[PDB]
Subunit: 346 residues, 5 copies
């Protein structure tokens, strides 16, 4: 009945000439390895380091005609992963690893099954900390495109070709949510074929389009910088001519808008360009700074020093205080319309 | 008397046809592996990473009829863990590992004992850093449910089935306490059977219901944000008409309630939704901000500028100061009743 | 003369029936393993993680009658630690490891010597990051008791028994000092025998009584919270009736005592109960807050508005200012006596 | 047809006298190993640690005449990296590793091809955390030069010589961008030959010239320290003679320029010398401090206490306030020209 | 000509009786191992952890008479480090490792050469994170002495003796600089021979005298705490009798000197004793606090309430303001002389 302890060593061992150092179809057509991944965990997307951690099931399917059995009755043999040191495997790697490891808890998390014609399925669990460049030109409203690319290191294009399969080449887990982002359904699958001075090597890559949850930044950044603009408008109502508190209220609201502007970039990389949260915290810094500059313009005109004109001399300091009480909720309201339309039109 | 150095190699070695790459009951019924865990250490439950560290004793019991002896007199053989590289073991893994390791101090912390009928006990010590999604909709008063699920990676459902045992499938250590949480006694034990394009794989999981200790947040968050509301009520008593200090006291209590609101989310993930500590630090931000807005309403009416009405002109600024001295401990007291009943009814 | 290259293989190898998978006195009395440790390094006692790092020399002594030689003349054989993969070793582990490793620099840091009757000394260097629960009810004046327990994993009580030796079972290095603590000389040595559903396993443990150096917390916490109480007493002297500065000095000393109360718990776990540094930073928060509340009581009575009683109307606002100038250094002084006697009586 | 399973063992194995412990041309001319690197990833350039992480492809070419075949028809043999434990390899290392590792995901990321005359190409993937000393004398405008040097450890100069190849010895990836720096195109390639008391060892090194993106520091450091200088010039306009706000505005702008000066060195090493961001934050600290010192000079002269001279007695306090209103935008403007010309001339 | 593939196995292998588990001169005089180190990298000297990272070349020279060849013509054999698993090596370790590792990039970074008489040179590259206790009684002006000690673990004094060699036992790299310290040229070389209950073990150690660069603490700690003392002297000039700003300037300069005193101990261990930066930040805290206490003494005497004495009643409040304007730059100047002479005399 061909006991299965003998059939493993009959097709892999010293007999039948199977050498694990030699690729299938040697000096012939190249090996066509097709791939698809299953993302278990996604996230911890850091921005100071500009990386993200993923946890994938890397499945590889190729054809090895030396492993094609004929006498065993069934169509597949799910095997022990101690056999995987004795068959040929493609030398796939990631061009943006930045450190990666296997999982070896209670057994090496590996899979091997061989069909009758020689089709070999090889599934391993890999934890990757993949590197992606962050384009933060409009920071709370951006759509990041972080990629992962699967190259060959030892075999060139005329020996080993990587492909995606047409039957859903990237599967995602059922309840995979992200704390700061969402993962869009459309995932690009293009080629990234590298040329070196050694040769040309195969490469396939999958783009992931991440869109931010803006609802966090409306709680910490935008609205608590919109309250302090209202504190700069409290100073336009008290006593209408001169007070020490109207400097002191314009003293204090600059302390926040300097600290909160520095506090808005506490967990960010040191990019050279200006971003969306900067030109909100800078324009709202002006409307705080122009509120103190307006009262300084009032006190400089009120403390200027007639027979009839002394009633008009207060009307030179009161007409300024009734334009600045009305026009600043028009200049702030025309910037607030100009800001969000510019960043919702992307 | 059958010396025990020979009996180990007789039942495991090249004789008797025992191959460690082949599961018990090959091409028959699937292997029924029953499991239970012992939690030594629990905790370091982070929230920026949304993970928790556990230290378990993973016990696995199955039946291997090829390991069934008959000539040895005693009922069990506690063995050396150097034997464990020569028997069949189930390829259990955790679907939410996020890195895990064995313990190999002074000996591999492993256990093996074999009964007469072939019952195999296999206990190992694993340190896990398990991932669980945090549902922080009501943050200091939530009941988190962090799980751990035990899957098979190479054998499908028709070859290997995981079960929990009915005799207390999750044991907890005697003095296992947590700094921030409590671990409830009722632990759910349900199934999580996964379907892939490779096959269907067995899965069992245990829910752990964690309940927060609210006593920490009453010391740092709630009561020091309740003192500053009383500082906003100090400004309703001094001089009753006009003072520079009543702006300056309303100046300073906004500096705290802006910093303490940002300080209340210093060790939290950046979730999009609003949580329980936000709508306490925001409503208590209003009662600070309305206290400055009330005095601005007094000074705008007091500095307005008759023959008889000038005594009533102070009564237009005194009646406001005696409603705001009484009605604000009524609006704060009706929110304080509405807040805690909403979050104790869960 | 029996050259020593042959005597190593004669007593350990395939001859003489020595099997390293079998414990001494098989199916007889249990193996009595006696232990003692030498602490090289102690410390890095974190409190957010509630752990401490130790660096021990773990010495183990047992009797192996199969290793008893008779023809070699000398009393001991200090051997190569490449031999330690060929003898029997007890499977000791620590029940609170939280990650631990050996030291393998320039040689495996191991020791082995075998007496003539078969006594085996086995000394290894281990770095442990041990877990101990912190009882922080009186935080700067507490006496912690952090333990370490040495269990067996595969052998039950009827096969292997751990003991401490009577000749100083815990040795400490000569100049071992700690930055925050002191290590007391009396060290408890009791039993911790564990019961599972697998069996009963041996356990011995050693308590370490750590006592804090209070001199750091007097420099940062206690005295800089005693200066700000004196700043709240500066406001009781200036102008005696009414000033904007007496609110503004009571404005500012609340900003410190709110920040310093939050700053006093910057490197602490989030325990639910109240500790000793809280009820010093809370009572000294009241004496700052009651100083501002006292001047608010003065200005509310001074700005109240006779023919003769107007001189007594200032004496209603001056008698309050001379009781609050004297009685507050009596209430603060009666708490300061009540505080330190409560926490020196432990 | 000479099947390739036999040709691997024929030229590497026990036959033909190939010993992997013996260098080519033994007791002859030294082995000339030529090298070139490909940089995949560059960056995470820390400054507290003074290091940088790189991810290179280290290609090594030498001549091994014992590997020179003649019967195989083709010009090269791309081999399995399991062969690399059986050939001679140069013992290259980096003199400033500070920890480094290989990449072993899905296969050891190694390359081996052997030409007909014995030319061996050996490409491996290394992640390095290389140490470079930071010269921070002018911090936001400096040009760093961080090196990497490739030494030999066991073979001296008379046995093994490292060289760079003339055909572009340092290749850079296509879209390699940096968040804070730019990598200049000209890369130095010089020698670093070391002399010890063991011998003289070969060394080659490549300088990398890094130039900072100044655009980040113009957003956080320079401009928010230029707004506070304008706040110190607001105090020169209000009431011209005496006000409590002109001290209080000079009170508050020192609080920022002390905190922002300490905040400007939050992610910097503790170097002894003075840098460019210090003498900008110190001179702008003076122009804040001299603004408070100017008003203190006004109030000391205005509160001095004639018959005719009392109108000139205000002109002694008004002429100071109209020179300090004009000359301080001349002293700040002459420093601002003197600062940037000094640091653009490098 | 004695081909070198045979000569390696002739003197190391099964022939000639060479056993790598037996030390040279067995049951004779002890093995005299002489040592010297080369320091490639030094630094990252942390103080919260109280450790430092070094990167050494550990060279060991002993005599092995079984390795003494006679037929080979040359004087030395630089060998492959794959041979090092077959010779005897001393079991040197460091008594204060705190974790350490080898360097294994592109080859194990090891060295072996054997002279004709049996002299063996053995150089390896080690990265150590060594522990040294910090004596911080005078913190910015201290001279630390951090050591490293090289013990034996398995062989006692009668079997193995460590020595330093007289020809410069500690070499330092050419351009080894430190960011915070300087390394003095005189390095002590003394003995540290340990006694245990196992036996007496050899030990040699080298002291390293580190001296701080004081230039950093003059930029952040000393001078920005000397400017705030000048802000406390601004309040002695304005209006000479009574002002709300003279409390408010003494209000604000306490906010800095409380935060900067806590900010000066942000990267320090929690030592119990008082250090040099504390008694500078405490005495300069008094001169800020006495400036507010002086003006409180002025306003208490000025607001006291004659016919002739009312001009002398201001002279009781003006003579205090002209002694405190002159004597405080005498008390601060006599402390500043007393402080630096005490800490330059060491
Ligand atoms: C792996 O996949 C590649 C690409 O799908 C296969 O290469 C292709 O092989 C076919 C026949 O084997 C080639 O067709 C031939 O084209 C030539 C002109 O070049 C002409 O004489 C005929 O029309 C003939 O059909 C095809 O060109 C070739 N394509 C490429 C890009 O190389 C390869 O055979 C597959 N290997 C295995 C083992 O499945
Ligand atoms: C491992 O556990 C599973 C589940 O308990 C066992 O499978 C069960 O095996 C029994 C008999 O071996 C099956 O009963 C049979 O049912 C068929 C109809 O399907 C009918 O002819 C009879 O009523 C007969 O009793 C049962 O259906 C089957 N259940 C499942 C879900 O497969 C299995 O035998 C156990 N294996 C070992 C080695 O203990
Ligand atoms: C390891 O240590 C244990 C405990 O010291 C030893 O067990 C003890 O062995 C003695 C004699 O071997 C026992 O004494 C006997 O007691 C029985 C009654 O139980 C009675 O017939 C006699 O009085 C006799 O002396 C003793 O009970 C037993 N104690 C325990 C707790 O088991 C053991 O022998 C030691 N093993 C080795 C290899 O040194
Ligand atoms: C590896 O490269 C080095 C450097 O290019 C080669 O060393 C050089 O070898 C040549 C001939 O083998 C030497 O030329 C000879 O010079 C002597 C005087 O020293 C004189 O008799 C002749 O003019 C003769 O041409 C050359 O000096 C020597 N240079 C050095 C620096 O050693 C070496 O041969 C190369 N090895 C291999 C295996 O390719
Ligand atoms: C390793 O070094 C040690 C110390 O340098 C050597 O030990 C010394 O060996 C010499 C002769 O081998 C001893 O001198 C003898 O002293 C005895 C009195 O003890 C006396 O009979 C003679 O004066 C004779 O010269 C010396 O005492 C001894 N010193 C110590 C501290 O043991 C050892 O020989 C060296 N081993 C090797 C293999 O080089």
């Amino acid at each position: 009945p061909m006991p299965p302890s003998e059939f493993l060593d009959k097709l892999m061992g010293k007999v039948s000439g199977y050498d694990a150092r030699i690729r299938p179809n040697f000096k012939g057509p190249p090996v066509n390895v097709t791939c698809n991944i299953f993302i278990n965990s996604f996230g911890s997307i850091a921005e100071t380091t500009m990386d993200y951690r993923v946890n994938i099931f890397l499945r590889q399917q190729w054809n090895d005609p030396r492993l094609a059995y004929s006498e065993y009755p069934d169509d597949s043999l799910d095997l022990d992963p101690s056999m995987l040191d004795s068959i040929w495997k493609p030398d796939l790697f990631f061009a943006n690893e930045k450190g990666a490891n296997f999982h070896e808890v209670t057994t090496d998390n590996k899979l091997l099954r061989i069909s009758k014609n020689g089709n070999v399925l090889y599934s391993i669990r890999i934890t990757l900390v993949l590197a992606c460049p962050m384009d933060l030109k409009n920071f709370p409203m951006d759509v990041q495109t972080c990629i992962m690319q699967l190259e060959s290191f030892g075999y060139t294009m005329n020996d080993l070709i990587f492909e995606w399969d047409e039957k859903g080449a990237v599967q995602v887990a059922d309840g995979l949510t992200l704390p700061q982002f969402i993962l869009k359904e459309e995932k690009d699958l293009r080629y990234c074929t590298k040329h070196y001075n050694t040769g040309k090597f195969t490469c396939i890559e999958a783009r992931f389009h991440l869109e931010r949850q803006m609802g966090y930044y409306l709680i910490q950044m935008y609205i608590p910088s919109l309250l302090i603009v209202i504190l700069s408008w409290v100073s336009f109502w008290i006593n209408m001519d001169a007070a020490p508190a109207r400097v002191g209220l314009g003293i204090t609201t600059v302390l926040t808008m300097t600290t909160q502007s520095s506090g808005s970039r506490a967990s960010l990389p040191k990019v050279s360009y200006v971003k969306a949260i900067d030109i909100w915290m800078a324009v709202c810094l002006l409307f705080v700074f122009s509120a103190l500059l307006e009262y300084a313009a009032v006190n400089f005109i009120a403390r200027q020093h007639v027979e009839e004109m002394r009633k008009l001399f207060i009307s030179r300091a009161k007409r300024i205080d009734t334009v600045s009480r009305v026009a600043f909720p028009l200049v702030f309201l025309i910037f607030n319309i100009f800001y969000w339309i510019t960043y919702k039109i992307i």
